[PDB]
Ligand binder design. Structure first.
Ligand SMILES: CCCCCCCC/C=C\CCCCCCCC(=O)O[C@H](COC(=O)CCCCCCCCCCCCCCC)COP(=O)(O)OC[C@@H](O)CO
Ligand SMILES: CCCCCCCC/C=C\CCCCCCCC(=O)O[C@H](COC(=O)CCCCCCCCCCCCCCC)COP(=O)(O)OC[C@@H](O)CO
Ligand SMILES: CCCCCCCC/C=C\CCCCCCCC(=O)O[C@H](COC(=O)CCCCCCCCCCCCCCC)COP(=O)(O)OC[C@@H](O)CO
Ligand SMILES: CCCCCCCC/C=C\CCCCCCCC(=O)O[C@H](COC(=O)CCCCCCCCCCCCCCC)COP(=O)(O)OC[C@@H](O)CO
Ligand SMILES: CCCCCCCC/C=C\CCCCCCCC(=O)O[C@H](COC(=O)CCCCCCCCCCCCCCC)COP(=O)(O)OC[C@@H](O)CO
Ligand SMILES: CCCCCCCC/C=C\CCCCCCCC(=O)O[C@H](COC(=O)CCCCCCCCCCCCCCC)COP(=O)(O)OC[C@@H](O)CO
Ligand SMILES: CCCCCCCC/C=C\CCCCCCCC(=O)O[C@H](COC(=O)CCCCCCCCCCCCCCC)COP(=O)(O)OC[C@@H](O)CO
Ligand SMILES: CCCCCCCC/C=C\CCCCCCCC(=O)O[C@H](COC(=O)CCCCCCCCCCCCCCC)COP(=O)(O)OC[C@@H](O)CO
Ligand SMILES: CCCCCCCC/C=C\CCCCCCCC(=O)O[C@H](COC(=O)CCCCCCCCCCCCCCC)COP(=O)(O)OC[C@@H](O)CO
Ligand SMILES: CCCCCCCC/C=C\CCCCCCCC(=O)O[C@H](COC(=O)CCCCCCCCCCCCCCC)COP(=O)(O)OC[C@@H](O)CO
Ligand SMILES: CCCCCCCC/C=C\CCCCCCCC(=O)O[C@H](COC(=O)CCCCCCCCCCCCCCC)COP(=O)(O)OC[C@@H](O)CO
Ligand SMILES: CCCCCCCC/C=C\CCCCCCCC(=O)O[C@H](COC(=O)CCCCCCCCCCCCCCC)COP(=O)(O)OC[C@@H](O)CO
Ligand SMILES: [Ca+2]
Ligand SMILES: [Ca+2]
Ligand SMILES: [Ca+2]
Ligand SMILES: [Ca+2]
Lengths: 650, 650
């Protein structure tokens, strides 16, 4: 059905001249041939060729699979000895696709073709992608669209098709959804019986966050052992953009390495603090200014055309936060390039960590402003917001803009409504923008280009359609789930139905993300992983911060949703600070206890890998490696000493 | 000089009858013979026999050394393949002593004699100890009593004589002493230029604590790799008191294990929280009551005989804290037995962790009471201390006991004097009680018993003298150094010469502890370790708590040593809490940054062990282990595809 194709290499010739294009193309085909791959060339687009790649021989494929397994075993990623090359069948499509992707991409010295798409020698090579298995995808979709949980076999199927990175994301999402049943039930019970800002709800929520994060750390270790990816960072793919200072030739492996000093990288990484403060200043200024405009227009201004003016600040936010975030992403990418980052995974993790500052600010600063600035203050702030009258100055006359005032009186529904928005309406709108609109845009761009050799015209047209799809990044889905967890950890006391909303959304999220991968995206090459990465630390940080924000909220809103109704008078700053101190430190103590208790419970795959390391070393040992003297002359054997002892005893 | 003796086994017959003593002694000698050891029996004391133990054959010793190395390698403690048994010489005296100690003590099923001193089958066996190498000890003492730092070779000598546990203690002490030069110089500079309660001193002190602890974690990893003890917990010696529930026979090693459920142990370990609260209540009650008596007698009471009454509370503390601590140690030992603890190291670590609560309370609660109870309060507390007049009631008449009052006026030198005591006078008195008085007591008890065969009478008399010496526990010295670090981390802003005192004391402490080990204690058997153990976590906790206490002190005593002179009026509780919040979280952020920066700097022995694991697996691999088809039929080799691409581009 896929015509035995492993990868499609898109070669762009449109932006270059014919002689250089022909020379580069011949070089590409020669490298593919010399690395043991079979090529077929077809017209991809009007400006690109499709190089269809396949293992040229079953023997060569078995040899490459065996060498990949041997490299994994040598670097300790697996403990079982690699089976001989005659029995080296790819145990899944993900393994064959990974071996062939490495053959195409790893440098010539490392034993492959050095095709680095969108890099120096290969800027014409635009994309290297495998083909979707449409029947398997549709079977999986229809099968687990009718179940509650995905089986371990279902997760293994995802891993065997899309690799362990996508597999880890779906395993984490399934575990998060399963753990969300407890907070969903408990928060519905609290919303029914206690209402919001309940001490018992906040305590149980913090405890649940602790338990889920520690459980997932343990489960990640277990799953990376079960998928044979534990310690996979030892064989992380280098990135071709890495600029080494000197070239050193280690003696263990007869190769030059290209060293770069770690301390110099740390000096360059000092710039992350200024980047973070820049992003905080810019994004917080935009968000707080739009919040002040929103407050003025919606609650201070009392002139004509109030809806058409209250839609102003939401528009400005929706236009300016994406733009400022794109600028900050450009700055973060330039800083990530300045830091050198030998490996692609290190580069990706560092960029994700820089972007997490922007994510935190844009996701949580609105609710933080409403909760800890608008509610306690803003009876003392709205006198300073008369200056924002000019935002309504263009649409209404100067006198009507001035005579539009009333007692400010803070809205006690503002915070609950903002939390309900971010945890329900944002979820629905994000589902729409994430699955529906890209799908419709793809179908529209297809029928636009489709409206205005005979035996492979269908396969080739569907390959040309797959070539237009989006490039799936599992980091985006992990980011979304971690930001959602942050909402739960930080602001769930405001509205205890947040975990119910997240439970429903995450059940739908598994299926809709799988659909997006299978239908709206090119099939990702089966990248490996032994963890969700920096997102685990992000979740730990969010839960820590939530222990502070939730306790602050429970203190401030003890008297109800109004709490300090605009005035900071009722808030005793020492009692708020003491609440925060004891809550955060009870959090840290309970987290330490839970982590230490879970460290005493070794999971089965982890114990099996430890025992297997022992057994491998035992096999190795079994196959290879196969005056003063007058003091001791007094009592010959153990019996003479026994009689001397008897004589001394009696 | 030691007559080739490896171990001396002290067999006590005094508390049993002659037939049972003879039977037990014959069983002991038979086990020693059957495990390959040569025995010689002499009269140890009037109530004990000395069994002198030696490897019966150089071949048997080489075989036992080879088997020990093979076990270490199989469990991953070392990565280099064990050399053959014909080249299996003990590379140090510590290795031979460890192999022979294991031969004597590990159970019969594990391949040794099952002699467990002071246990069921062996309650008569009182002690198993090696003999000191007096010439080597005296050479080391005289050699590094004349140097500033001990060389890496000196530390290796300590490890090669006394094992890696003692070696880790001395390495930690040397590193701590070396790092103390920075705080000593900086604190002397601050005491000269700024005085006490300086913000810059407190900041620099917290930063130094962070850096030293993270550096020592890194150095512990490096040193355990250099001493081939990394991961030594995989071969931790089991403890004979362990009560298994079921007996399971794992298939990897053909042996029964004796499983006990970890969750049941965790249930039993829940009792540690009640023990900790009990110890806190009892010790804090004693300490606070004696502090109130001290305050009343010294500053409220103004009658006759004031010195003979002010010595009352110090006496009561010195008598009651040791007694209450012995009771709490009995309770902690019973709780440690209730928890089952398969291995001896786990038992020891758990008992040390239970005792650390008592250590923290008794070491720091006096200064904490003075700093955060006596200074802010105690103008509002001394009205409640008239009830303590009865403590002076026995020595003075009732009227003289009543008419002994004056304005309370808190002493502004109390806190500085208490800190100076705990950091200088306690150090000197502890040096005395630790080295001088045990030495003199030993010499006195010797000449008492020495006052009121001909060729080995000197060796035998010195073995009988060594048999009386104390049993060295390196945990005591680690406890002392960690409590000292706690004083530095918690209360150094009060008096910035604390690190100078600790620098001098720790230089003397290296030499005096080595002297105590070599002269006042039996030679410890060469127990292994890859860390100082729970004391690293204790240091981290103490530095964390110090970030809170030091910032609180700097806030409270901004106006000088008087600070809040008895009244809590000048202390703004929100400003104190905000100071604590920002100080502790700046601490945690800086600690995270320093830990992450140090994780990027792999030390040489660590990198060497990783590369050696790779090389060992490479040696193992080198010795053993040696319709759709019409799509691909269009272009045969890389050249036909090249011409198809050329025509398509044209
Ligand atoms: C307030 C903070 C605002 C900016 C935030 C940091 C943004 C970092 C900008 C990224 C960056 O460092 O640029 C590099 C220049 O390196 C540099 O010599 C700049 C280092 C600055 C040293 C201080 C480019 O790399 P190269 O020069 O190789 O071309
Ligand atoms: C981002 C902005 C976060 C906002 C934080 C503080 C703003 C307050 C600044 C201090 C202004 C104090 C102005 C003032 O005079 O009020 C006094 C009492 O104050 C008071 O009760 C103080 C009450 C202020 C209420 C703020 C509680 C925040 C609790 C923890 C939130 C951290 C969330 C961070 C998540 C990342 C007396 O009249
Ligand atoms: C795709 C993602 C799906 C998102 C999940 C959708 C629904 C579950 C979350 C509940 C949605 C409720 C949103 C509307 C809502 O808040 O209604 C509340 C009352 O009715 C409800 O309590 C609804 C019952 C729950 C308001 O009144 P309150 O409760 O504040 O007093
Ligand atoms: C300077 C001001 C000082 C005080 C100010 C605010 C205090 C707010 C409370 C902060 C609560 C968090 C306290 C903290 O320091 O967290 C560190 C971890 O960092 C992390 O995960 C890393 C996550 C970083 C989060 C991204 C920054 C937020 C964006 C905002 C950017 C604005 C600038 C500790 O590390 P640690 O070893 O204990 O691991 C623990 C692991 O188990 C939790 O992931
Ligand atoms: C978490 C941080 C947010 C909470 C801490 C915000 C500090 C709130 C504060 O200023 O304290 C209140 C106002 O001060 C006072 O009355 C008297 C002091 C007035 C001095 C101005 C306060 C500066 C606060 C700015 C500090 C840095 C932010 C006293 O509150 P209360 O007495 O009711 O108890
Ligand atoms: C230990 C963990 C907590 C210890 C208790 C905090 C001790 C400090 C208490 C500080 C003094 C106190 O008792 O707080 C009272 C009320 O607090 C309150 O409603 C409630 C106080 C907040 C309770 C803490 C929230 C729970 C946080 C979950 C963390 C768990 C993490 C680990 C668990 C797994 C004050 O009344 P107040 O008239 O002035 O209010 C005015 C306000 O309503 C203005 O609208
Ligand atoms: C306030 C706290 C005060 C005491 C602090 C804890 C002290 C623990 C005392 C140690 C202990 O647990 O005793 C064990 C009894 O086990 C137990 O069935 C007692 C468990 C108590 C269950 C609750 C003796 O072991 P076994 O019985 O085998 O003889
Ligand atoms: C062990 C005992 C530790 C002692 C801690 C607190 C005792 C204070 C209890 C609260 C009594 C408050 C009594 C009171 O009415 O005072 C008010 C102001 O208080 C106030 O400024 C409050 C000022 C109290 C000063 C205490 C500062 C301690 C700072 C951190 C120390 C932790 C060390 C823990 C190390 C393990 C007004 O008038
Ligand atoms: C074995 C362990 C050895 C212990 C280490 C011994 C000495 C180093 C510590 C300094 C000892 C000073 C103890 C006596 C002392 O405190 O004197 C101070 C002044 O003189 C000094 O500053 C001494 C100079 C330092 C008091 O006046 P202050 O400085 O408070 O104003
Ligand atoms: C309930 C009350 C709640 C609030 C009350 C006081 C707050 C005092 C501030 C405490 C500051 C310490 C905060 C804390 O929770 O420490 C835990 C570690 O425990 C540890 O090391 C273990 C050391 C335990 C110390 C022994 C207890 C002190 C004796 C006192 C006994 C009286 C009862 C965190 O673990 P974590 O994973 O982040 O590792 C971090 C690692 O790098 C530091 O060793
Ligand atoms: C670290 C913990 C130690 C510091 C926290 C100790 C709490 C100190 C406290 O009670 O707040 C002060 C007294 O209360 C007041 O004025 C009014 C409140 C009086 C109620 C009695 C205080 C209970 C404190 C006990 C709480 C648990 C301990 C106010 O101080 P200020 O206004 O000057 O700001
Ligand atoms: C970030 C880390 C710190 C941020 C600053 C704290 C912000 C909160 C400030 C709270 C308000 C403030 O500014 O404090 C002033 C003074 O403080 C002061 O002298 C000094 C405040 C204490 C400064 C903090 C000590 C440094 C702790 C080192 C931690 C480093 C850990 C990580 C670094 C490696 C108040 O004056 P006040 O008249 O009321 O005093 C009366 C008193 O003297 C009664 O005798
Ligand atoms: Ca979504
Ligand atoms: Ca998603
Ligand atoms: Ca000492
Ligand atoms: Ca000592």
């Amino acid at each position: 059905e896929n015509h035995h194709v492993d990868y499609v290499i898109r070669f762009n010739y449109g932006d270059i001249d014919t002689p250089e294009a022909i020379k580069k193309f011949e070089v590409l085909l020669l490298e593919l041939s010399e690395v043991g791959l079979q090529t077929e060339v077809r017209q991809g687009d009007e400006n690109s060729l499709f190089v269809f790649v396949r293992a040229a021989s079953k023997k060569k494929l078995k040899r490459a699979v065996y060498q990949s397994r041997v490299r994994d075993w040598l670097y300790g990623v697996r403990n079982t000895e690699p089976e001989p090359a005659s029995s080296a069948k790819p145990q899944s499509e993900a393994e064959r696709l990974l071996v062939i992707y490495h053959l195409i991409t790893v440098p010539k010295a490392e034993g492959g073709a050095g095709i680095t798409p969108r890099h120096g020698e290969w800027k014409n090579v635009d994309a290297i992608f495998p083909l979707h298995d449409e029947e398997t995808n549709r079977q999986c979709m229809r099968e687990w669209s009718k179940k509650t949980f995905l089986s371990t076999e279902d997760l293994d199927r995802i891993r065997n098709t899309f690799g362990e990175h996508v597999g880890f994301y779906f395993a984490f999402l399934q575990s998060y959804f399963r753990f969300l049943m407890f907070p969903a039930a408990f928060g519905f019970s609290c919303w029914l019986l206690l209402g919001s800002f309940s001490i018992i709800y906040t305590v149980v929520n913090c405890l649940w966050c602790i338990v889920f994060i520690e459980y997932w750390k343990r489960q990640e270790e277990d799953l990376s052992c079960r998928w044979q990816t534990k310690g996979v960072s030892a064989v992380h793919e280098k990135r071709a953009e890495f600029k080494p200072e000197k070239e050193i030739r280690d003696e263990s492996t007869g190769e030059v390495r290209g060293v770069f000093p770690a301390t110099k990288r740390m000096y360059r990484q000092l710039l992350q603090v200024p980047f973070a403060l820049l992003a905080a200043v810019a994004l917080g200024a935009i968000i707080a200014t739009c919040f002040a405009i929103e407050i003025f227009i919606s609650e201070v201004y009392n002139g004509p055309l109030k809806g058409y003016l209250v839609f102003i600040p939401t528009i400005l936010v929706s236009a300016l936060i994406p733009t400022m975030s794109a600028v900050l992403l450009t700055v973060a990418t330039k800083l990530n390039d300045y830091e050198n980052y030998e490996t692609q995974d290190a580069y990706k993790v560092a960029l994700t960590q820089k972007i997490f500052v922007v994510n935190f600010i844009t996701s949580y600063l609105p609710i933080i402003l409403t909760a800890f600035v608008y509610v306690p203050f803003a009876s003392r702030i709205v006198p300073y917001l008369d200056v924002f009258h000019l935002t309504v100055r263009p649409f209404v006359s100067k006198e009507h803009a001035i005579k539009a005032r009333t007692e400010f009186s803070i809205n006690p529904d503002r915070l609950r409504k903002q939390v309900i928005y971010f945890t329900v309406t944002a979820q629905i709108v994000g589902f729409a923008l994430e699955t529906i609109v890209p799908f419709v845009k793809q179908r529209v761009f297809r029928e636009y280009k489709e409206y205005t050799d005979e035996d492979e015209a269908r396969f080739l047209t569907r390959v040309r359609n797959e070539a237009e799809l989006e490039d799936y990044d599992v980091t985006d889905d992990l980011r979304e789930m971690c930001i959602q967890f942050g909402y739960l950890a930080l602001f769930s006391p405001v509205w205890p139905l947040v975990p119910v909303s997240f439970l429903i959304n995450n059940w739908v999220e598994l299926r809709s993300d799988f659909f997006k991968i299978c239908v709206e995206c090119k099939r990702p090459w089966p990248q490996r992983a032994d963890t969700i990465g920096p997102w685990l630390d992000s979740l730990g940080f969010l839960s820590w911060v939530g222990s502070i924000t939730s306790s602050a909220l429970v203190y401030m809103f003890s008297n109800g949703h109004e709490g300090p109704n605009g005035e900071p008078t009722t808030i005793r700053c020492w009692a708020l600070l003491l609440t925060i101190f004891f809550s955060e430190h009870l959090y840290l103590i309970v987290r330490y206890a839970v982590r230490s208790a879970l460290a005493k419970l070794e999971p089965p795959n982890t114990r099996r890998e430890r025992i297997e390391r022992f057994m491998m070393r035992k096999r190795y040992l079994d196959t290879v490696l196969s005056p003063t003297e007058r003091f001791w002359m007094r009592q010959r054997g153990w019996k003479e000493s026994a009689e001397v002892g008897l004589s001394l005893i009696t």
